[PDB]
Amino acid sequence: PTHDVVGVGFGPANLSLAVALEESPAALTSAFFERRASISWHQGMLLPAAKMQVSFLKDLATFRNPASRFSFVSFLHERGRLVRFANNHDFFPTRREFHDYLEWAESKLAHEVSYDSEVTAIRPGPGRPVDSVLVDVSTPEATRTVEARNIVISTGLVPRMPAGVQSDEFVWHSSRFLDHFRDRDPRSLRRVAVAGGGQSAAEIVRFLHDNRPDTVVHAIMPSYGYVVADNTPFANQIFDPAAVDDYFDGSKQAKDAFWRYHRNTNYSVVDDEVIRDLYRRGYDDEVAGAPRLNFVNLAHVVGAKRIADDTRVTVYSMAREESYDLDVDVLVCATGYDPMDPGDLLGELAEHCVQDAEGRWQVDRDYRMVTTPDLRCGIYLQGGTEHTHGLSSSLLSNLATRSGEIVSSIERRK
Amino acid sequence: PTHDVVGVGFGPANLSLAVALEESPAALTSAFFERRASISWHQGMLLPAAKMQVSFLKDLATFRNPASRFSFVSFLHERGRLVRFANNHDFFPTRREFHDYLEWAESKLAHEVSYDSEVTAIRPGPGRPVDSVLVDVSTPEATRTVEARNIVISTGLVPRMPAGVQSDEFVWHSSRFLDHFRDRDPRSLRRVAVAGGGQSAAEIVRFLHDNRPDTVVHAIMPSYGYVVADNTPFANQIFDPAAVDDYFDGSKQAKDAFWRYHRNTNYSVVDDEVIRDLYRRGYDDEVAGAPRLNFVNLAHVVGAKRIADDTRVTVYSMAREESYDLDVDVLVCATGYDPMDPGDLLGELAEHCVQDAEGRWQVDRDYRMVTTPDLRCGIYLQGGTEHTHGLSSSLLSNLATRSGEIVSSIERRK
Amino acid sequence: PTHDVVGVGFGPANLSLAVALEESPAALTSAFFERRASISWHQGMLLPAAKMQVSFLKDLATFRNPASRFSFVSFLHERGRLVRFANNHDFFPTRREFHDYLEWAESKLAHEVSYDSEVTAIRPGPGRPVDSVLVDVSTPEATRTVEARNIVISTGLVPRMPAGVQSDEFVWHSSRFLDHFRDRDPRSLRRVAVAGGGQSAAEIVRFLHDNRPDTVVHAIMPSYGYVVADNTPFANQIFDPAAVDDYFDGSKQAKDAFWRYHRNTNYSVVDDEVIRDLYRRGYDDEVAGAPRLNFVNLAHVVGAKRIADDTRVTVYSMAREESYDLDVDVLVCATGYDPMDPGDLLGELAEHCVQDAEGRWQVDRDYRMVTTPDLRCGIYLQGGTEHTHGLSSSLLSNLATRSGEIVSSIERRK
Amino acid sequence: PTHDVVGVGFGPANLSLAVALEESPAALTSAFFERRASISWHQGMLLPAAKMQVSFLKDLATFRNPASRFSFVSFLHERGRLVRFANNHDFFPTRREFHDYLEWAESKLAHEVSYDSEVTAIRPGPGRPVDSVLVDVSTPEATRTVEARNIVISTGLVPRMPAGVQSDEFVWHSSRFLDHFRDRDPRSLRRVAVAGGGQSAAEIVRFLHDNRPDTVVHAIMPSYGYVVADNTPFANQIFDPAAVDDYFDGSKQAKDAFWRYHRNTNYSVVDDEVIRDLYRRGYDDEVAGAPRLNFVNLAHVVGAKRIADDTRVTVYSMAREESYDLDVDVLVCATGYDPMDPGDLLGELAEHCVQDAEGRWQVDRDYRMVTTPDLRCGIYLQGGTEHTHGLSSSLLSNLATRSGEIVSSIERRK
């Protein structure tokens, strides 16, 4: 039984693909594999009041199908909160509510997802030219192999730590913050260092300040103070489908310009509200004569080591061009991610994937990897397309249209 | 040819009824009569920057059917502006765009509306019990009569002038501001008085200031300065279906409390943005040493007379309990409206309509007038229900659910 | 030793008077008596993050003397926070910082205040016409009498409870909220009722929600939801000195209009930020399926009794026209105040104070009580002038100019 | 007659120096020379509604002397607008009001400024070591030479045009926009190109759109849409005196970091309000089906030639790496400035001034150029210190402390 399409991973990207498949009149068979036990979207960073980067209209389907049964608006209506949400006049749901939306949409889906199923390899299919691919899957029970004419790789971002720092009991990546924080004894988090200059860093510093009034927090950033995220309407435009075209068709010079002029837009920077709240918190602490927030500007974390009951963080000060140690209970590295890369999953198939001038994968406008005539199946990428498609590649700004374009491409070439 | 329902008027209210009829699986036959040549929604006040009082989610259908083909979102999508609108992060469309939305929705409607058709009378049908009503319609050509099992009266608000003032060549009601303004020698309006303290008053003053740099404007209001409109979430709530229930089921004391505590919500007051813009305009003019905006506080217009080339406005000052004259070119009365009166059209049909203690029509929760048992036809009111259903009666805050409830009532009794 | 002027009370009003005295070149001798042990400005409501109702420019002196050494700006500069404050771009200090400002200003004052000095009576001095008053002062030590040519009464508002409700161990007025709350067991207060519809009510509900995650709060208000405070620029104008003139010189009709149109300005209503925060809190609780905030609309507290381990609050529902009981741990009445009563401290002297035809004290523009020629002393009121001077009477919106007026009047008559 | 200090130029920088001199108890003699007939601060960009980049507290003196008679607050008070300004709750004056403030402050100044006095050279005084300098001053009338122990050069920024583009009748630099615009028939500019991506560019495009309804405008910018200015509190901090210290004492790496992370602060970027207004304008035009604003993204103006009745603007598109000609009435280059350069006026004295590695002038913390022992005169720079003192060098964010520092340095050395 050869599936038209297998989806590797079930985050919001492949969820939008599943929705696009259902909504499409095309008769496509599919299966989706997710390593985790259920849908799990950045749960380590589901802080109270944390807000979505994108508006509720940039959901799973609305920009493609404005009357989708999977829209955020349909969700709110079924939950009996559409009116209440509307009265709030806020375009941005909390990340918590958005997670509930994902789970609701997954349930509404006709076709069931296979969980506890980690894809370990993608292998060529019998036949030459290769007409299909073989997907190896591991369940807690056994292993199994499935076959597909096309595959959609959407395995998400990979956590990035500072060079020379490794995660441990006392050194956490921001992606795991709440997982560790949960049932940690408070007495044991009297002092926390948070490295990074972006949204997750600021959110965590603010959560710590608000959660425990005794915790001392060192915010270690390369900039001289948090830099604001650009959320103005012309900025929001670079994440429109039309801007994907402009970036895709654009010269290397133009592509460089996108990243140069517009890199201050989401995760590497911080929302105006979060910044103001932090500054307010610092100010009121000063009035009260009880300072707690230490903003360590123009600095980087270059090492961490557990010494007795202390996590000794080595900090490099750019101003002074010297490094020095800071003892804390826990170091949190809100230091971002590396992009998705299909390379390693693809193993031998990789060799048939055409590369570009800088050694990166070529990809067509419809998110299809460029291949040699030795390979005839579709390997589509949701994520990993920063070089070809631009800044929207790992975000939730364009789920409806990217998933629709991929389904349309599959129907087309079938 | 006896219709299931006839709608009198085709403003947004009956437009939402038509949509509710189409979306309902019930086989109801209908006809709508509009006296104007085409849909025409407060066109005299379609000023350049003017904004809707309600959010785009409070459209024709979405609160009832979140996947309606008639939603504002579906409209934006067909117009190719959904993404552009979403990036703006504004819940409130301009009144101009909303008018386009109404026209778009009217076109998308399967059933055609009868325009240039003024309903002149409604009268009791043939027989006992009275199972239908006869609706007399004047068209440019000839009059005719139509029969219906149910009627929905939605003829809108009636312009109200200050006691002692009549509309003329130089005395306008705000509802006809742009109609008159477009037709004038532009250098003919160097001095304008605008009476009223509410949204239309402030919008017109602001438009005049912005429109030419030399116009002198007298804003005459009973308050000491414009009072702000309450647009907070707890206030938007009174305009929700659930709050219609609370008002409807509520004692006379409770109903009085709604109007007392929450009268400062929309048209009698002024949105924060407009107020700040006007104040800013006044301030900058003062810096420039060129004052143009005269705010006449705690005052009322009590008469108007044309003397030669001047409209002589008689203004009563509350502060000093005396009146004085002010010479201008035009006086605009942004002095609001009287509610819809279903008594207008009913004539002999009232006989069968039950009044209350104080002589106001009794109306059921489903917007159906309470009738003597000889009358079996449904007379439904969209508007005119201020006493029974509350502040939402003449607004666009609840179109989807009111229209749905009326359609459901009609089907139920069928 | 006969003083030119004696100040009764030392809140912000008499503090601004002390400053006006020091800045004036006139050689006036003064003494101020404060019952408390030190300056104490609404300390029971000094909640975290609570904000001033007035901007930092409406301080003790700036509107009179823009280069005062007692300005809020001079305070910030001496504290080394002027730049930090300026970068925040917020016109409204926290009430906690404002309290620090009052203490700083009091210290900078050359002339020392007599604390622990309760004024118990004001009596006619010797001789005719009466050229001085006698001020009876109780200290913990003894009692004494001081003599003065003029007196300024600024004793502040008086806590008002709902009719039929007395303050007790478990029934608090909002003015003492933090005083009681600090001396209480965190898990003693799992259920709290807060009566009132104004700023203090909403702030307290917010504080409770934020301070413990398990507390259940019943917000009992006469309106259908919190009503927003008007803080637009035309609204702030009614608190300008120029608007005091308009109100003072205005007919009764006019004065009525001020209170009618502009009652929605400060303490009886709730600032937009606090309202949105509460609504957001309620919404997120609903998402989490853990409701804690119970908004009891259209209702009044009409009685309270202690029964075993509970406080039984009798609530009247306007909608249902019935009353019912609500068991809580503590009832907080954020039910406002009655105005300062100049007559309180006045005995025989009242007989020489002229009333109007509704029985209210006549007061000149310069805040001087109108007296028969039998009395030549100045009795000035800071507070208690709601009928004569208007809405600004008990606020901090006009401290600089009211105090300056009073000092100028005193010098003029000397 | 040898002055203690001579100021070259009389913009806001030397204006703050004059104030600092007057407020200082030190007996310093001074003279200021301005080439224009009167104070003239960016008058070509005094557009309607244009706002200051810095708050009113960042005025001539307040951060140094919070009770200065030259503060923006004292100005407002003398103008009878302090209360009116305060009620507006806006930290940012219009540029027009700020200009009035400068004029007011200049008038209040005891010592009169020499206008129509262009400084043409600064030369060594007699003797060695060099204890004075001679300032050559050209007037319309004559020339003369004055002698000074110290000089402060504050001659402002120098307009910069795109490479290969010269200003002409139809090619304007933004600094002269209103000067040209006002000398044109109102109907003479129906088509306009505006090059640049920063504040002045956006302000001009907005002004044009708002000023006539027919004007077509091409906004040509290197970015993909306007980029927002960071005006958050941590950002405003780099402009405080404490941050000048951090930048001054900082390594080259740290200084580079300031410019790298925080270049997006003022003139190179666009404020939130302006951006949203433009996007709104574009959206409403689209709804109206009358597009006028053409945003040309990822593009540079590379040439301009007059051809008959047109200006043929040559635009380079980075996207497609092709050029095309855009015919219009006028090209406005809002392309910024080059910094102040003291070498200009210095000539022979330069040999006594010490340069660094990259050939830049060395400058002490107190803004004094570093000199050899042969030169004992103070040459102070207000402007031209971007390399040594950082981003605040050419702004008005630090007038009070920079001027005070310079005066203190002069007194110290005396």
Ligand SMILES: Cc1cc2nc3c(=O)[nH]c(=O)nc-3n(C[C@H](O)[C@H](O)[C@H](O)COP(=O)(O)OP(=O)(O)OC[C@H]3O[C@@H](n4cnc5c(N)ncnc54)[C@H](O)[C@@H]3O)c2cc1C
């Ligand atoms: C707090 C936060 C921080 C963020 N940081 C950034 C950032 O710094 N930069 C940026 O560009 N975007 C960032 N993101 C955005 C992020 O990429 C998205 O919001 C979104 O998660 C992406 O959707 P996705 O479907 O591509 O996948 P995901 O949410 O990443 O999930 C992919 C799924 O694939 C599964 N999976 C992976 N490998 C396998 C396998 N071999 N077999 C089976 N299943 C597998 C995973 O379990 C996962 O559930 C952040 C988001 C949040 C909430």
Ligand SMILES: Cc1cc2nc3c(=O)[nH]c(=O)nc-3n(C[C@H](O)[C@H](O)[C@H](O)COP(=O)(O)OP(=O)(O)OC[C@H]3O[C@@H](n4cnc5c(N)ncnc54)[C@H](O)[C@@H]3O)c2cc1C
């Ligand atoms: C500028 C402005 C000011 C407003 N002022 C207020 C206010 O002060 N207070 C308030 O509560 N609401 C006010 N409204 C809100 C207003 O009622 C609603 O926006 C709105 O028109 C929708 O409801 P409708 O269909 O009930 O009304 P109506 O729109 O106005 O439309 C009804 C239609 O019935 C037609 N009609 C009337 N009689 C007959 C007949 N005999 N035969 C055939 N056709 C007929 C009319 O021509 C009209 O087309 C205002 C709205 C705007 C835009």
Ligand SMILES: Cc1cc2nc3c(=O)[nH]c(=O)nc-3n(C[C@H](O)[C@H](O)[C@H](O)COP(=O)(O)OP(=O)(O)OC[C@H]3O[C@@H](n4cnc5c(N)ncnc54)[C@H](O)[C@@H]3O)c2cc1C
């Ligand atoms: C939380 C809060 C709620 C408020 N509620 C309202 C409101 O509902 N309505 C409103 O209009 N304004 C209200 N206010 C504003 C309030 O009045 C002012 O902020 C301020 O307190 C007024 O200054 P004052 O000096 O006039 O009075 P106060 O600040 O009250 O100071 C009066 C002083 O006189 C002292 N005193 C009294 N009697 C004697 C005596 N016999 N002898 C010696 N000393 C005496 C008192 O101890 C006190 O220190 C509120 C303010 C806050 C912060």
Ligand SMILES: Cc1cc2nc3c(=O)[nH]c(=O)nc-3n(C[C@H](O)[C@H](O)[C@H](O)COP(=O)(O)OP(=O)(O)OC[C@H]3O[C@@H](n4cnc5c(N)ncnc54)[C@H](O)[C@@H]3O)c2cc1C
């Ligand atoms: C629209 C606008 C755009 C701006 N653009 C930028 C920008 O792009 N980047 C940036 O960093 N800041 C920018 N600024 C900030 C700006 O420099 C300040 O606001 C302020 O002008 C600087 O003060 P100043 O006194 O140093 O300079 P100036 O305001 O420029 O004043 C210098 C004065 O010296 C006079 N002068 C010059 N030479 C002589 C001479 N030889 N003899 C006698 N007098 C002389 C001039 O006539 C002038 O009056 C801008 C400001 C505005 C309003």
Ligand SMILES: [Br-]
């Ligand atoms: Br968005």
Ligand SMILES: [Br-]
């Ligand atoms: Br709902």
Ligand SMILES: [Br-]
């Ligand atoms: Br929003």
Ligand SMILES: [Br-]
């Ligand atoms: Br993260």
Ligand SMILES: [Br-]
């Ligand atoms: Br501190």
Ligand SMILES: [Br-]
């Ligand atoms: Br440190």
Ligand SMILES: [Br-]
């Ligand atoms: Br995202």
Ligand SMILES: [Br-]
């Ligand atoms: Br796409």
Ligand SMILES: [Br-]
């Ligand atoms: Br699509």
Ligand SMILES: [Br-]
């Ligand atoms: Br709304």
Ligand SMILES: [Br-]
């Ligand atoms: Br679209």
Ligand SMILES: [Br-]
């Ligand atoms: Br909005």
